[PDB]
Design a protein around this nucleic acid. Sequence first.
DNA 1: TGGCACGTAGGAC
DNA 2: TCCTACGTGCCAG
Lengths: 313, 307, 306, 317, 305, 314
Amino acid sequence: HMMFVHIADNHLGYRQYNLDDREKDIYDSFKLCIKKILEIKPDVVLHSGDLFNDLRPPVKALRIAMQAFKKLHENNIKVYIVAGNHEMPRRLGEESPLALLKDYVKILDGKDVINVNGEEIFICGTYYHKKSKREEMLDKLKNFESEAKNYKKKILMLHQGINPYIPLDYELEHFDLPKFSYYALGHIHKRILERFNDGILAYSGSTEIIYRNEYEDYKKEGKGFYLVDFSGNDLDISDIEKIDIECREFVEVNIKDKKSFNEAVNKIERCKNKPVVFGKIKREFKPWFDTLKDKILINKAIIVDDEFIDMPD
Amino acid sequence: HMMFVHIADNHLGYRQYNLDDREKDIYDSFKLCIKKILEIKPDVVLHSGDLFNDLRPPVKALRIAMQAFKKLHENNIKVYIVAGNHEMPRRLGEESPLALLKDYVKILDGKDVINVNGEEIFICGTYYHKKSKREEMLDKLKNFESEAKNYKKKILMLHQGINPYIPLDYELEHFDLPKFSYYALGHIHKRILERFNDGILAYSGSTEIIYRNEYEDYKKEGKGFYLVDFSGNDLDISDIEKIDIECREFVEVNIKDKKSFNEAVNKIERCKNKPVVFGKIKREFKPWFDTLKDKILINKAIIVDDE
Amino acid sequence: MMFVHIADNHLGYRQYNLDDREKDIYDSFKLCIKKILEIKPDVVLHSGDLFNDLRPPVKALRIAMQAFKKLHENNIKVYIVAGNHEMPRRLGEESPLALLKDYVKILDGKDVINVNGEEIFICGTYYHKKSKREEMLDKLKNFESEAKNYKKKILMLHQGINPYIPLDYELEHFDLPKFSYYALGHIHKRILERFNDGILAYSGSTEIIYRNEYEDYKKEGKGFYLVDFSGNDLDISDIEKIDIECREFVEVNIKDKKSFNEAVNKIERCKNKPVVFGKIKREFKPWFDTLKDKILINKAIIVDDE
Amino acid sequence: RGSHMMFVHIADNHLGYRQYNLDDREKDIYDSFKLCIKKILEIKPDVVLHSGDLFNDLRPPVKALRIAMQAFKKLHENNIKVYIVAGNHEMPRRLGEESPLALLKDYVKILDGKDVINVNGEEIFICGTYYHKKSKREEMLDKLKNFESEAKNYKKKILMLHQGINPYIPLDYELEHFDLPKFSYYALGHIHKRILERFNDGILAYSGSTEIIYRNEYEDYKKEGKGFYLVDFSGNDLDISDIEKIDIECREFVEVNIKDKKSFNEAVNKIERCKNKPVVFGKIKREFKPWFDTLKDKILINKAIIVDDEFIDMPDN
Amino acid sequence: SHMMFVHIADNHLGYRQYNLDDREKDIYDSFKLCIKKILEIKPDVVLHSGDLFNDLRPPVKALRIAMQAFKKLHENNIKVYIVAGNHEMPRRLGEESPLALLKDYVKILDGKDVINVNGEEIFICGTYYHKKSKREEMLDKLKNFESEAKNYKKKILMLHQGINPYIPLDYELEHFDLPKFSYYALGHIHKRILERFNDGILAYSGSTEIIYRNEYEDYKKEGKGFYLVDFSGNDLDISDIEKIDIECREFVEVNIKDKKSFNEAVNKIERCKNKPVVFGKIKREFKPWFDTLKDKILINKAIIV
Amino acid sequence: GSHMMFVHIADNHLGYRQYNLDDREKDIYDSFKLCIKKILEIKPDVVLHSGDLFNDLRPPVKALRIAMQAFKKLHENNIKVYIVAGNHEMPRRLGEESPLALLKDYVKILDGKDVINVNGEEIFICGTYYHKKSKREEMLDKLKNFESEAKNYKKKILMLHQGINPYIPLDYELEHFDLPKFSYYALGHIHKRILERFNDGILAYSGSTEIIYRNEYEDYKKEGKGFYLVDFSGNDLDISDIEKIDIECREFVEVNIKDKKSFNEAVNKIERCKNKPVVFGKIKREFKPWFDTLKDKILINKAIIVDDEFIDMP
DNA sequence: TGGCACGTAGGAC
DNA sequence: TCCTACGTGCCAG
């Protein structure tokens, strides 16, 4: 009878390594998510911020985004979003890139209760606040619990880093946020879905690889978005599907001998499309490795000229 | 029987001297024109480029632009625009700020024939080409000549620097452009209107002061936009109205004695809106004048110990 | 006090001109060094044939220099004698060992090392040909003299001694004076035994240099010695053999189905892909080529005798 | 002269080359190199660009490696930054084999890309790559067009290469003179003769071999002189005028054409006037050779063709 | 002794700082003063390494003093050698060098010549100032001097150049360019430079007066003038070179930022032997002060920083 | 003969580099050397030099060499020489020395009285440097003083380097009625030869020893440039005892090519030249490429190219 | 597939 | 001890 989608951090207009393809890659994954969300036809979409990677984004990005959310709004898919750190203006009167979406999307800085088919469910959220103004934020938070006391199904949307989930730096401690059904969170790039405070908390995570860091979280957790049904009285991990998204592949290498070299080539060969290769290569192998420059998108590996006696036990 | 509007170089999102107020001024004047254009209800609007001052403009700017041109298209006013230098992409696949308007506006890089009451008139245009590609442009232009052979009323839109009109540097020599009724030109910030090639040529000029230069061209000729009628078969200067727009006035100073100071104070008094002051003021007088910092927007003056 | 006796690593040996075989030598060498680093002895005695040639592969020199650097940085004193393969031939030609002069003591005389907390004597000299034996004897007889007044005295040599390697040898077993420990090199098999009021050792090659030592590696195990010399006396009891995993060789004699299955069984139980050698009847060669994936290199003679 | 910046262009010392299998020749190569190094040290340049073939072989003689490491240690201990690109002789052949240049990793920068050297008080871009063969020229071009790109916003830009460029070495070349982008200085290597001349809005140089590797370069050493270049690169502009060529005294080759008493006495005297027992080559008439065989002691090695033909050839003027 | 000679250079005759009679005079008298002392010394040879005159077409007075000087020197059977400095080298072909006016007293060197001293045999060679542009030319010239001097016991080389370690920008020769000679009689450099070099001894005699605003204190520590070499014995060391100093015009620096530096500056000027040129810094607040005290001084001119 | 003779010479203008040509600078040097060569052949008793030896106050070294090498020959042959400063040899700045000063060891620079005792007689000489009009008054007293010291002398010679009124209209510093009665007037400033009886005696300008201007090209043709040789053996001096020794020097041809006659007339004038001449004057635009054919035969072309069509029909 | 270079083994003085 | 010939591993085109 009901379902909705949790997505965040598409980072529209990100140009990794100043490469054309990476900027395209970001766009493609975003669209790919959108194509599925239209296939899914959820009743609501929760967007946890950083839709755009910058405050004054590429024209191409706003184009893609505006056409995207328009397509959703035209299919009776309700959408909510909170401002990520990148979409929050710095000068007084500077407008958010999210402001270009006012006709397709509800920007949240308070409470709202959505009457869905066929029920009534509560949403609250607020834009990205800094560490500096946490006290400010707590007052906001206790007030959200207050207006949500008498609601069965209550959702919190935030774009902040929570203490256990991201060591440094965080703006919130896991004990700061009151009891809610679903914690639609954003700021963190890796998938985080686990039971929490008599309910269930999630970070949808970034929809493409933003750093050389998350290379294998896509391998083991996979990047994309969550699809929560929220039909029944309870919500558990069991009623949350993670929809994964194909994105630009990264193969790590550590070429130090004949084995590691061939292991590197083979990894690159089974790539569907030219991968970002990174890690380390011993000098002796680098000219040999330059033979794959056609099969590789961009090589971002450190060249080691030391001869190491490193031996495994 | 018919009328239309020529406007260009609004430079939306220009933030002169990194002043909040200056970014506002540009925004306001654009809006002011739009309100007047809506009062007028012209049949067509020609915009010759540099609508935005950058490729990636402020978000407020893009909203104002979209809302403005939306309002125009919803009052069934047809709109044409050509890319200025600032709206031209640099990377292959980087898109123009003008691309965000494709639903209200026809972006021109070719021919189109507009049906008005009760006649038929030809329009062509192309984006800003660089000097480097002058020869390129000529093929384009010589071809527009060809497509316009059998048309009575013909308008060309361009955003370039033309030879007599802007000495160095220009992209076209004034003998480059074919015979057309109206020359909707852009790249130049001062008003330029004069008869030309069995027809009439115009630069609409910036809709606000983009440089410390045009401070008095607004005073002496006035900035704004043109309103050409083209009602009759022929068109001369007598059928072009120039609409002026209140915008930020600049006062020049050269305070080296009591005369130049007090007389300067008087000019500021006679300014309707708080002016940008520039020129020279002797060091001795600067603390004296800083008491008057409330009636002035920003003080941009040289400190002189000499004269 | 403790010290390490090692020799004949033969760095840069490329058996059958295989990439992996040159590696084998490298790795086992790297492994001994790794083991020598955990142990932390006060001294390491290297008895020569560190390198297999005068102009060794570049990789070998880099590994070698890096190795003894790591030792020198852990305050491990190192002594070495020139092996036969590290001896220059043209006048003014240099030894690869010269590339180690900043990490290693090259020995051609006496030295007295002050350890915590003692004082102990070492002497040695480079590889001599059989030809110049008489020359060598004064060196030893003079070593005899310079070591008389020392409790603990060690002799380092890289030669073949008569009982220990029948033909050919450069020294006779009655040629060497009384020393505590005889840290020797030139021979590839392990040789440790009591001798002349002390104890004599050949560390033996740290990898398989010939199809010969394939099983001497099985029963004695290849690697290096760890002598403590903590006490005033030293016996066999204070000498540890640290072994080294190295490339296995399997011998075959395929003339019927019997030998075939047992040969396969020997190959399957191999931890590391083996070098196979010996004899195979021609009728069996296409059959044996099916086993090419589990094998490194086939060096077997194809005989169609019958 | 000065400066805010200076550098040294050197290449092709071919350490460990043993011409005619002579001991004296292997020394000769070593000594010439040492001399360059000694001179580089009195000069105290801010940078040294070495364009490859430092070692004559992939697995060099130990003395060569010893000399090389001691040499570049000496440069590095005097805060002289050094860059090198792999010559053809220093390119590994089996996969995992290391270059002898790798023994220098602590004293020298091995170049296969861009780098910005910050000198007092300025900023200058360096790029280079190891030796590529003709076979993979396309591969090389992508790189070069990419070097053009990363150096566009740079005032002073240097390219290091160890290749043969088309006009400069007819057969065989790996690159055409129109392949290389505009750079201030072209630090080139593969060629043994000195070549310094303006090129593509900048200046191209081959430092050339620091010794006579073939009986061929015998006179290119006489008129052009073998050694290395010292470019100052002080100003925004660079011309030949800011390049000193330091020559290096090395083993002499005397050419002979002994056909009469004129040529014989002139050959003996040219040989007598030699500092070191010279390599003699050319032609000698059979009639003269036993007479010439007295000088084998005054001569390092005789590589002359013995002609028994009687020419009645007569000169005009 | 039995034998001696003189190394001198860079007098820059006719340098007329700020178009003053008094400055050129300092140059003229100090020059003669060297000559007088050279007349006390009576050496067998005098070596002049160039820039005798500051220009190619010098004032007439300079040429008067020059010939008058070398006349008396040459009349006392004193052998004299000279090489052309940068300032004495022709630019137009057929223009003559001012040194040509001395051909009756002096041997101008562009090659070898052998001096007979009592009672021995010693080799001299030298060449004019070559530009950097033509260094290669110079080396061959030098490689040839080495050749002709091999079989000579005591050998002297004369040059007017800047050598690389000794003068960074710009130099024409690298110190490893010049062959082995006993004494390196060098010129182009204005400061005294004497040190052992290439199994012998190299010298820049240095300017005989202050030609630039720089040498005000270099003259203080090393002293300006010329060297006096004996060369009697087989070897030559620094120990066999006497340096004769020459009295010349003093320069005083000031830095008035308070009364402290102010009075100390005034007092330091007072201990001057000859009417000094005053320069340095004075705070605007202080400027009228010395202009009241300007009468006891020849020229008042300070840098405004 | 003779028993007694002496030489009057002036205005060599040493180091003059006309049209900045080497050959022209050389020409001046050469003509001067030739005069000295002839003078040494003659072996006269005295040489009077009337100034402008050098063309500038700071002359080229080459000039000073030639001058000094020359006067050495004179002074070494016991010929005493007198000179007065020309306009080009008079200092401007106080303490600046005259280029003539480099000669104080061979030559007497005159600014007063001196009596030369010749074998076997006695004759009075006076002279002074070049004065401008400005100090004519100055000059008059000097002259009244010279006349005074010479009253009791039979033979008295005046040396001067000025322009005298009839002989050079504008501008002159002295009037011909200014100079007192002397035997011989050894004068300088003028480039043309001037010899004539004057004030109970004889006046002379030796004239330039080469062509200093495009002007004197033909005063040389008809009068000839060089120097005078005065004998002064007897008590009286007349024209008959003065030989003018001429000096062959660099030729100048004037042209006026406006038609075929004038073209051909110019070409022949150039052909008849011993040495490549300095050509000057006017050439019509119409004729110039034809005239460019003689550039080999010509030292330098310094002629105006007229592109005007003149109806000049006189 | 040809080289190409290293390594292995038989031989000469 | 040298060197030769030969077989052969491994990158080449």
